[PDB]
Every structure is written in C-alpha cells, then in structure tokens.
Structure 1
Amino acid sequence: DVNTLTRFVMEEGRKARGTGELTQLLNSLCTAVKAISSAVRKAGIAHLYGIAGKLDVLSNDLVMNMLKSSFATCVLVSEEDKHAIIVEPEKRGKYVVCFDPLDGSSNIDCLVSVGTIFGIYRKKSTDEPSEKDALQPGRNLVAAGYALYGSATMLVLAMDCGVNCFMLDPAIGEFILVDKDVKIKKKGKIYSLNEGYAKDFDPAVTEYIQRKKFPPDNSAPYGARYVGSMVADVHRTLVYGGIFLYPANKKSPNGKLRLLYECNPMAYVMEKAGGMATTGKEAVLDVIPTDIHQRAPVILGSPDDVLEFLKVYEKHS
C-alpha cells in the first residue's frame, strides 16, 4: 500500500505508545518543508516581476513558525539566528530542534540544489528552557533528517526505526514513502570534497584523496562530485555510496560545517543507514558542543570508505 509521511509517523507514534508531540512536530516541519519547496521552485515569481503591476529568511520564518505553533518545541536553534529562540510558555512542548532552514542557499542564484536540515532532541530537565538545552551530543537525537529541493523534493527522516525516504508529490502536496528502511552501500566509488582547499589539507586527507585517484589495490579510481551544497552531497552519498568530507582548512581550522544542525543530523542519518561519520578524532555524534554554532570537520559515508579514511588518519596519528 501507498504510505505517506503523515500516515507513517502516526503509525510509529502509536507503536511507541507516545502522546503525539513528536508527530505534531514532524507534521509541522512537513508543512514548512512543502512551503519552502513551493518558494524555492519559484511559484509566484511572476508576482515579484510585476504580472499585476529573502528565501533563506522566509525559510527560517516558515520553520520557526510551524515549529512554534506545533506545541511540541521549547528551544529552537537556527543557523539564521544568533541565539537559541526560546518558545513562549503557552506554545511550549518537550522537544529541542536544531535546524538549517535553507542549506546551500548562498549559491541559490545558480539554482544549485538546496535543502532543510533538522535534528530533534528531547529536553529532559526540570529547568526553564535555555540555549544550553541545545548543547547535547548528537547521540541524543530522537529524530533527524533533511528535505532535498533537488530535481525533485525528498524528505529523508531518520529515527531509531532507521532511515525512510519520502518524495514530495507536488500534484497533491503529499510526501509519499518511496524508499523504506534505507541502508547505504558498504563501499562506494565517489568521493566528495572541495579540492580547491588542497593547499590547506592535513596530510591524512591529502593521502586519502591520493588513494582515490591512484588506487593501491589496482581497483578503478573513484569518481569525484562536489555540489557545494551539503544536502545534495550527503544525499548522493546516501544514494550511490561513497564518502563526503569537509575537513579543516586554513580559513576553517575546526571545519566550516556547523555541528548541531548540519553535522549531527547528517551523521545521525548516516549511522541509522549503517554508514559512518567522524571528525577524524571521534564520531560526530559523540562531540559534546559548547556553542550552538560551533563548527566540526566531517567525513561521512559508506562504512568501508570512512574506515579507510580513518585507517589513513590513524597512520598520521
């Protein structure tokens, strides 16, 4: 039978015997995501061009607003927002959400694939909600995923039950389940990183990419792909296998990607899909953050590829 995100989430919820907040949260995110998709695909653009005589900002407003009205959240961290937003007590629910409302957007003018990234934490404590409630390691995630506004719009949702992929059908505004309990290839054949930073790379990354173009075991060299938009690169990685890297560079000594709402959700998705995600020194999900916008290196993808990077990392110490 056809399954939808709405149906899927209510069924899982009923099995966990949960009260419904997470469902209401995920339903509201789904609303926000459909509306961001609408805007990204430029529906209504003629009206801007005068037929009857910002997108990152709107994206933030959509998610911020649908999350508040959900009655499920209490602390909301966005890449757009300097500090955590503390939800008003009347609208307060139990979950903390870290999101990137429109990832890839700084290059939206070339119509590059963009996406929304979210990671959901339950707030355990009896304290009044504070920004510090967002400072959890990714291991604590209850749900995470992303919507990709590529050629088509897909929501990938990860929870304990694994990874599940939902295609937006724009004809009916329905997220349709199209890839159940997804698992990433053990080993892939594409590597993904901005090689313009070659000059800046640590020797571990240098040697690893060197292996990719010039295989030690006489296998075929890996192909290379770097959209430059993380959701697009992480999705392809999930879909076709392989490895994605944003290692530290000169201008980014702790990486450029932000831990809470870029790294953690993609590391969670990956792990739930039987892939891996490391900073090199430890797993992304094990990093305990001290700043809500802290940056992290990230090497993620197919388990064999990632263990081969760390193999090399571990050689250089």
Structure 2
Amino acid sequence: LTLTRYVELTQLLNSMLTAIKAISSAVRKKLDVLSNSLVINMLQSSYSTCVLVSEENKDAIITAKEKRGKYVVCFDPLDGASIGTIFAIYRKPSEKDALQCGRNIVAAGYALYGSATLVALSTGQGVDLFMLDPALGEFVLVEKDVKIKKKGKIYSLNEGYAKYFDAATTEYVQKKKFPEDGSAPYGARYVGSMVADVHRTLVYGGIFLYPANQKSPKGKLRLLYECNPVAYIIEQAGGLATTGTQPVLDVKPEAIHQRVPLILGSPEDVQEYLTCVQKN
C-alpha cells in the first residue's frame, strides 16, 4: 500500500521522501532557500551520502567526517502554480563523482506539488506512482510500473522561441499542427515548469521539448539534476529522452551545472523528432 513499506540506500530514500513531505507542507504554506536545507540535511543525516549536488548550491557538497556513505545525490530541491522536486542517486573521494552518466543511476524520481502531491520513483524495475495521503502522512501506491503511451497526441514546447529554432524543430512542429496524412493535429500544452510538463507526458503520452535554439546554444535544462533524472524515469517507462544527438542518459557530464537540450516522451513521437533532426 504505502511507500515506507516498499522502501541501506533504502534509508537514504525515506530520508529524501521526508524532505519532500516537508517541502510539500511548506509549499501549501525565502523558499528555494529553505527547501535546500531540508533536502541537504535529511540526506546528510540518514547516514548514506558522500557527495550532494544541488541546483541552488553552485559548488558540490561533500558530506564529511562522522558520516560519509556509498551514494551520490543530485537534486533540484524546488523547481519553478506547479512546483516540483527532482533527484537522481548514484553509487561510486570528491566532486568528480556526480559526473557519472545517467546510465549509472541507482535510483531517481520527482515530486510534483500540484492539486495533490505526486511522487514518481524508480530503482530500475519500472516507474511507480505514489500520492501523498495527507491524513496519514504517508505516500500510497497509486500505480505500479507505469508505461508511457506508444504515441501521443500532445506536443509540448515554448513556441515563443519559434523565431530562434533550428529547422528540424520547425518542421516537426509544423507536422504536428499540419499533419499531411489526413489525421488530426496534435494538441499543445506547456506549463513551463519542468516537472509538470514531464509528468503530464508520462501519464498522457506525447512529446516534450526544450531544444537548443540560438539563445541557448547548449540548451537550458541542467543535465545532472534535471535532465538525467526525468530521462531515467521516462526510459524506465519505456519512453525516450534524447539531447537530439545522443540519448540523454549517455552524455558523459562535464560540469555539475552543465546544460543540455531535452526531448522526451512517447517513443514513436521522439523517433519522429529524431528523423526531422537527422534530415538536417
């Protein structure tokens, strides 16, 4: 039934899960600040971490001394209404240890603070969905081993960058509004908070894009704690996540605040994008 039961590293997880429960409370009501201390200090205790890498701290954190642990954590404690929390957990003495490619992830997940509090979590045997029962203070299994639709009917990106797109992006977006095979055009949706847009894609199917354009030549989304984790969820659900040249999980990170492009979603949909890319 509940998250605590299912969930070593296991105690690094409920540690994280407790930061989420706490953040969520605070968010239902200075705030990016607070979220960070929570995620940092729950993780640092529990007694399982050795290297943390956060969006807010722009040096890596070495949890030192009386407590070091086998595992590395990368996270965005508060991301962005619909806010969220993203994280990826890696195995293995210093900063260079978060730079494992996404293929090295031991566990990753996100929290979505929307109408209800949702957690998508995976340790390598599919994605499970959990809602937070607030009259119980536990997460509860709502869906086991989710899987993304083969093909969606929703495309998701900021077409305010239309003027700055590469030509592949433009063609793809035009075949979504003007399909020439008879079919209906896709629907569009862009919340502009990354967890909300990523989560919608997992549950409803479709495609989500924050590609490179001329004002973000190497994209805009952080690789370590934003791109790698949702890429891991989506590929675990049987989707794709590409930077447009690689798979996202295969990029060898080179700096903790590295940026990469991001295209993810239903697999058929992402292959239609990769085909437009390749023509150019």
TM-score bracket, normalised by the shorter chain, equals: over 0.9
Unmatched segments (≥5 aa) in structure 2: none
Counterpart of 1:7 (choices 1, 5, 8) is: 5
Q: Which runs of 4+ in 1 moved over 3 A?
A: none
C-alpha contact 1:102 1:114 (8 A) present in aligned 2: yes
CA contact (8 A) 1:191 1:223 kept: yes
CA shift, 1:305, in A, is 0.3
Residue 225 of structure 1 aligns with an amino acid whose one-letter code is: R
* Residue in 1 that maps onto 2:130: 166
CA distance in 2, matches of 1:222, 1:136: 36
- Whether the 8 Å contact between 1:70 and 1:91 is mirrored in structure 2 is no
2:22 corresponds to which of 28, 35, 43: 35
Cα displacement (A) at 1:91: 1.6
Instruction: State the alpha-carbon separation in 2 of the partners of residues 178 and 189 from structure 1.
Output: 24
Question: Structure 1: how far apart are the matches of 2:188 and 2:123?
Answer: 30
Counterpart secondary structure, 2:88: strand
- Aligned-pair Cα RMSD in Å: 0.7
Partners of 1:209 and 1:159 in 2: CA distance? 34
Q: 1:114 aligns with which of 79, 83, 102?
A: 83
Cα deviations by residue, 1:68-118 (Å, 9 ceiling, x for unpaired):
0011110000000011100012121110000000011xxxxxxx1010000
Using the alignment, how far apart are the partners of 2:201 and 2:161 within structure 1? 21
Alignment of 1:257-268 (within 5 A): 257-268=221-232
User: TM-score under structure 1 normalisation?
Assistant: 0.87
Which residue number in structure 2 is paired with residue 45 of structure 1? Answer: none
Q: What's the offset of the Cα at 1:285?
A: 0.2
Deviation at 1:315, TM superposition (A): 1.0
CA distance in 2, matches of 1:299, 1:67: 30
CA distance in 1, matches of 2:47, 2:222: 27
Q: Distance in 1 between matches of 2:95 and 2:217?
A: 25
2:269 pairs, out of 305, 313, 317, with 305
Q: Deviations over 1:36-91 (max 9, x none)?
A: 0001111xxxxxxxxxxx11111111100100001111000000001110001212
Matches within 5 A, 1:9-88: 9=7, 20=8, 22-42=9-29, 54-88=30-64
Distance 1:135 1:99 in 2: 13
**Computing the radius of gyration over CA atoms, which structure comes out larger, 1 or 2?**
1
Deviations 1:13-40 (A, max 9, x none): xxxxxxx2x1011000010000000011
Match of 2:164 in 1: 200
| Offset, 1:230 | 0.3
- Residue of structure 1 aligned with 2:203, choices 221, 224, 239: 239
Q: Do structure 1's residue 98 and structure 2's residue 79 form an aligned pair?
A: no
1:178 and 2:115 correspond: no
For 1:201 and 1:159, locate their aligned partners in 2 and report how far apart those are by CA, in whole Å: 35
| TM-score, normalisation: structure 2 | 0.99
Q: Any idea what the Cα deviations from partners look like across 1:113-151, whole Å, max 9, x if unmatched?
A: 01000000002xxxx2x1100111001001011000011
CA contact (8 A) 1:159 1:272 kept: no
Displacement after TM superposition at 1:250 (Å): 2.5
**1:279 matched to 2:243:** yes
Q: Would you say 1:218 and 2:182 are equivalent positions?
A: yes
User: Does residue 79 of structure 2 align to residue 140 of structure 1?
Assistant: no
User: Matched residue of 1:88: which SS?
Assistant: coil
